[PDB]
């Protein structure tokens, strides 16, 4: 097979945390807009059958907790899992309301030796960040 | 056997060291785009080419306006980052 | 109008921050497997999915010997980073 | 559309750059075999018909000179452009047998802005190289 296995009873589980608020010490701007970014991606990731969850504005901390959290259920009869992540950022980094977060520690969670249950399985981690402050001007 | 660092898959809404960009009124450039390929495409391409018309759409038909002319008619293009063993196929 | 840094695309032979093996004898593992998957469906396949096919057969069929034990029985995953707007068939 | 146009006169060029030796100044150790993929590689862009063209032990210099000079030539006629790098490197670099070169500025030489006649045609780069020190042990 040339094709990961989708037809586990279910689709997989997939977490959209979305951050709007950040607090004066971070020096980040209201995220406007996000909101819809995060009711358009529920809506689609149910018609997937996904088991969407919703999260807003969560401290570095948080985020953290929820990702241990989510890499320590049992996802056996699951086929993929799907991680939003809707915030401000810098290359390899994404912010939580009270701060920075390396992306590293996100994801390591879920690594195959981490999260034994999702071994062999697609894990989609979908980013709507800033990687940096450069701008592309375009061409042509 | 295989690398624990395999059947990853990174959708990124922009470049590496590149602002990303997002309207106020409609969400942002990236994840509209996402979810609307998604919408026409998840019964019948596979998930690379959904993530490759994305690329075509957000660096095609999105151009930031801005009152300020550093920020103004600036552009964007995702970044796919697959590490996938296999192809994706939502149905 | 088009972003500058699309229409790029880098296949890495490893993930980020890991090493990459090359045998002596028949040459790196990345490279022996690229060109072997270009050579039975560079035809057929468009290009993303055989760079997934590469990442397979990276992963799967390798692993390093060594006698030295902490450089032995180690893995490795391609990285695939594509900014292409379009799919790239050879034919 | 929805897939580039190969059918120009020309499928494009391929630069392979084959490192193998190094100074001693770098540290880094004889890269045996590179000369298989080299050989291996030439000869599969060439069934592609692509304009291959084969380069060993460059200094860092050569390098950024050669990709300057590539960038400089005319495309027009070409429909992709393919640059291969077989050699030592850390995360986002590549060593010249003389020394470490970001692979920043090779790349930075074909943006949509810098080489007009590849505008619009897709660039790809295959690199052949360490991105660290990190081992992957596997799992299952
Ligand atoms: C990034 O997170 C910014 S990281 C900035 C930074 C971080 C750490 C250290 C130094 C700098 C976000 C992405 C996100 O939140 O999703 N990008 C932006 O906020 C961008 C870039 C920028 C913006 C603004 C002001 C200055 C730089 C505010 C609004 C702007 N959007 C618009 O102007 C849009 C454009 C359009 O759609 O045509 N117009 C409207 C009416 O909304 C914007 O997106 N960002
Ligand atoms: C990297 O360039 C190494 S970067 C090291 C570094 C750089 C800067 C700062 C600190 C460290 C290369 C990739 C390349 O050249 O293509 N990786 C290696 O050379 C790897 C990792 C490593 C190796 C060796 C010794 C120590 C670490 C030498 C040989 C080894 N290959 C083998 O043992 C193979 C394995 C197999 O095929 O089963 N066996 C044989 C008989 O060749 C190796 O590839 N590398």
Same mark, same amino acid.
């Given at each position: 097979?040339?094709?990961?296995?989708?037809?586990?009873?279910?689709?997989?589980?997939?977490?959209?945390?979305?951050?709007?608020?950040?607090?004066?010490?971070?020096?980040?701007?209201?995220?406007?807009?996000?909101?819809?970014?995060?009711?358009?991606?529920?809506?689609?990731?149910?018609?997937?059958?996904?088991?969407?969850?919703?999260?807003?504005?969560?401290?570095?901390?948080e985020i953290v907790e929820l990702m241990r959290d989510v890499s320590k259920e049992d996802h056996s009869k699951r086929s993929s899992?799907?991680?939003?992540?809707?915030?401000?950022?810098?290359?390899?980094?994404?912010?939580?309301?009270?701060?920075?977060?390396?992306?590293?520690?996100?994801?390591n969670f879920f690594r195959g030796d981490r999260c034994r249950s999702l071994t062999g399985k697609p894990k989609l981690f979908i980013?709507?960040?800033?990687?940096?402050?450069?701008?592309?001007?375009?061409?042509? | 056997?295989?690398?624990?660092?395999?059947?990853?898959?990174?959708?990124?809404?922009? @470049?590496?060291?590149?602002? %990303?960009?997002?309207?106020?009124?409609?969400?942002?450039?990236?994840? !509209?785009?996402? /979810?609307?390929?998604?919408?026409?495409?998840?019964?019948?391409?596979?998930?690379?080419?959904?993530?490759?018309?994305?690329?075509?759409?957000? @660096?095609?038909?999105?151009? %930031?306006?801005?009152?300020?002319?550093?920020?103004?008619?600036?552009? !964007?293009?995702? /970044?796919?980052?697959?590490?996938?063993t296999k192809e994706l196929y939502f149905y």
């Amino acid at each position: 097979d040339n094709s990961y296995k989708m037809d586990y009873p279910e689709m997989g589980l997939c977490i959209i945390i979305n951050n709007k608020n950040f607090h004066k010490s971070t020096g980040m701007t209201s995220r406007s807009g996000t909101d819809v970014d995060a009711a358009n991606l529920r809506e689609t990731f149910r018609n997937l059958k996904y088991e969407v969850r919703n999260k807003n504005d969560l401290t570095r901390e948080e985020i953290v907790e929820l990702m241990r959290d989510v890499s320590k259920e049992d996802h056996s009869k699951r086929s993929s899992f799907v991680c939003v992540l809707l915030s401000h950022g810098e290359e390899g980094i994404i912010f939580g309301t009270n701060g920075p977060v390396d992306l590293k520690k996100i994801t390591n969670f879920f690594r195959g030796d981490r999260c034994r249950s999702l071994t062999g399985k697609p894990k989609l981690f979908i980013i709507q960040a800033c990687r940096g402050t450069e701008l592309d001007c375009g061409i042509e | 056997k295989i690398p624990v660092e395999a059947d990853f898959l990174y959708a990124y809404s922009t @470049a590496p060291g590149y602002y %990303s960009w997002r309207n106020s009124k409609d969400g942002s450039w990236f994840i !509209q785009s996402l /979810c609307a390929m998604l919408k026409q495409y998840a019964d019948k391409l596979e998930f690379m080419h959904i993530l490759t018309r994305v690329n075509r759409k957000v @660096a095609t038909e999105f151009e %930031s306006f801005s009152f300020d002319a550093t920020f103004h008619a600036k552009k !964007q293009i995702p /970044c796919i980052v697959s590490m996938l063993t296999k192809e994706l196929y939502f149905y």
